[PDB]
Structure formats: structure tokens, C-alpha cells
Symmetry: C3
């Protein structure tokens, strides 16, 4: 399977954002990878119900994604993955799915989170995982649209701790 973009985004299929990434990479499908969202009936449906037509969408767990990534059915398929956070990306790599770059899009603020950028807010578990990701050599970029200039997330995160 050809993974064209792995993106982090708390809000998922919001506004014209995701559509713009799609038109640009010409992807066949969007897959939300998250164990929580895959076992939660009220949230799997509700996420995949505002995704664009002419585009297949589905929500699976880190385990099925791992299995699907290697399955021959989707051989050559062009996809774009959506993640709620950086740990499931780590969990997915520890299942044998190579992810070259990750586009950090947004992680909504909460009272126990630490705002790092206008759109990204992290916890302690989030930071460890962003670390581990640079350790596995994964490029970490920050931007909403294909037209915003790519900022380096690593430099941004470090200047904060």
C-alpha cells in the first residue's frame, strides 16, 4: 500500500482542509487509525460520515491497519492516514508499517494539556511519542494546507521544553 501522507488531527474531517490534501495527492482512500475510535460505535460512524464522496473512507485499529498495509488486496493503493495522536503512529510502526513523514495538523487544547502552537496542544505522553518519532527517523512537519510553508515541528517542540 502506498501511504502518501500520515496526518495528526484531533478534529478529523473538518472543513475543506482534508479535501485539499486529497486533491493534491490524488488518494483513493482515507483511513482513520485509532484503537479507541474503532471500538466506539458512536464515534466510528460519526467520524466517517462527513468525509467527501468519490473517496472511500474507513476507520480501523492499529492492528488491522498493520494487517491491511501488507495485504495483497490493497497492493499499490494510494492512501492517506489520519491519527488522533503520535502514540498510535508509534504503535503502528511497531507493527511493520513504515511511515516516512507525519504532518502535524492539530491537537485541541484541554485543561491538562500544554499549548505548543496555535493548533497543537500536548500532554506528557504526546511529547515522549513525538521524541520516539524523531528517533525512528520520522520527519515531523507542521502545516494545515498544502500551500502553507512546511515548518519544522521538532525545532518548535524543543524550544518549548
Amino acid at each position: 500500500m502506498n501511504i502518501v501522507l500520515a496526518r495528526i488531527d484531533d478534529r478529523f474531517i473538518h472543513g475543506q482542509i482534508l479535501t485539499r490534501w486529497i486533491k493534491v495527492h490524488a488518494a483513493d482512500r482515507i483511513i482513520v487509525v485509532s484503537d479507541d475510535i474503532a471500538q466506539d460505535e458512536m464515534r466510528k460512524t460519526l467520524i466517517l460520515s462527513v468525509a467527501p464522496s468519490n473517496v472511500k473512507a474507513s476507520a480501523v485499529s492499529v492492528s488491522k491497519m498493520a494487517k491491511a498495509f501488507h495485504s495483497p488486496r490493497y497492493e499499490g493503493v494510494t492512501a492517506m492516514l489520519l491519527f488522533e495522536n503520535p502514540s498510535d503512529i508509534v504503535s503502528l510502526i511497531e507493527a511493520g508499517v513504515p511511515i516516512k513523514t507525519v504532518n502535524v495538523g492539530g491537537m485541541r487544547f484541554e485543561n491538562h494539556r500544554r499549548q505548543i502552537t496555535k493548533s497543537v496542544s500536548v500532554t506528557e505522553q504526546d511529547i515522549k511519542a513525538f521524541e520516539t518519532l524523531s528517533d525512528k527517523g520520522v520527519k515531523l512537519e507542521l502545516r494545515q494546507l498544502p500551500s502553507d510553508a512546511s515548518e519544522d515541528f521538532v525545532q518548535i517542540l524543543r524550544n518549548v521544553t
Copy 2:
């Protein structure tokens, strides 16, 4: 969770009806609450597949709705509930979800039902539940669109028995 309208409607996501209620209350999501529909794979999909985009939709059971209503994830969220009948509304209130008013939209006729209005047909179990609903103080209104004048369902139902 902010419940802006609890509606009874046998036919669900039919015509422009539901869309009109949505534009008017500006709701983020539509949730179908029914135990039968939530365990029936051929009906959960089939109901939520003709719902409008720009609107998240999902079908849960009286039990998960109860749980979700109080969950902090959906805190402040604006929703509109859809019901097949008045018993599940009673069942939902006996789970701790306060419903102020209920908009009776339609309950299709059947051979063992008693037609009460052009669009509502009830059974004996339906009537008991509409009673219990006025007992819990729930306002019961009748109308299809936000523009039809609100008729009183209670007075209408009583004039029939």
C-alpha cells in the same frame, strides 16, 4: 450535551424535513436512539446513509446514549435525537438524560395500529408511553416543519381514546 430537539419519526432521514430542523437549530450531530436499530447491521447503515453532509450522524442504543449524554467528550455539543417511538424516549429518561420537549413527527400506519393524525399511528404500548411522558412533565408537540404551527399532541391524543 445540549439536546436541542428530541423527535419521533418512523421514516428517519426522509426528504428535506430533518434538514430544515437542523439549519434552524444549527446542530452538529444527529443521533438515532433505538436498541433495535443499533443491533441490526442492515438497518443502522441504511438509516445513516441518507443523512446530510456537514452533519455528523450515528446510531446508538438507549444505553450508550445515556452514557454519551454525560460523557465529557461531547460536553457542550449541540445535538438532535431521532426516535422510532415514545418508549425508547421513556427508557432514555430512566437512564438520566433530561428531555424537555419531544416533537412528534410521524409513526406510520400498520394493520394493528390506530391512526390518530394524518401522520401518527399508535398501538397500545405507544399510548401508555405518551402518557408516562406527560407524567414526567415532557411537553409533547406535533409538527413536521419549524414553520408549521405547533399543535398540542396531548389534547389530540386524549380526544381519541
Copy 3:
């Protein structure tokens, strides 16, 4: 339940093809009948997510289809079935659902398949089932659109073996 067309198509809800059959028969719902697709979470969603609105869609197994076909809820309902292959059509008939004609649309080529027409490729199991289908008296037709002239599949398949 009134079955207006039973169609074989590996690619499912692709292009304007299916929509054209729908407008022509005026069907309320599209049901994908397949045991594999019904138990595969990443594929049930992903198939039914690119189907047209104003049309209810769902994916069930040969067993539930059998059950639904006879259920009184969907009495009189007008539907169109989608199949991945000819065996599940046989499996469905051995459950008590009469299918008069089957429209062969496409079965994508693979390395272990034998191309029979520009769009149909079969295996040994496929052929036996197409046989059994002519044995049960099921008319087998070939065409993509309601406007292409109906070719006979049986004559086409035989000229190949």
C-alpha cells in the same frame, strides 16, 4: 421484497455506472451481499461510503439477506443487489431468495484468473457457479449500462471452455 436487478461487480460503487441502473429502476436501496465484506470492518464501510445519497445502502451476508428478503418490514421495497462473484448468488438462492436474472458487470483480472471478456475474469470456482446458475434457470446477461445491448453471457462463456 422486490429485487429489480442482481448484479455482479468486483469494483462496486465505481463511476456513474451503478447510479444509472438506479435511476432506471427507481430503487430505494442498494445492498451488497457478501459474507467476506460483511465481516470485514475496513471493507464494509469503505464500500458503502461512495454510494449515492437519496439512496439507502448497506452490506449484509448471504444469511441476513435471506432473512431480510422474507422479513415483513421490507415488504414491497424495491432493491438492487451487488455481488462480488456468482457463488454467493448460488448461496443466496439456496436460502430461499428467487433471483430471476443476473447482470454480469465485471470481475477484475488477476494472475490466477482467466480473462473471458474485456471486463470479466473468472477462476474455476466462478465457472462452476455460472453453470449452476443456468441450471437453476437464472438468465445471465452481460452489460455495463442500461443502454448497452444485452449480450448473452452463457453463449460467451461456453465459446471459451
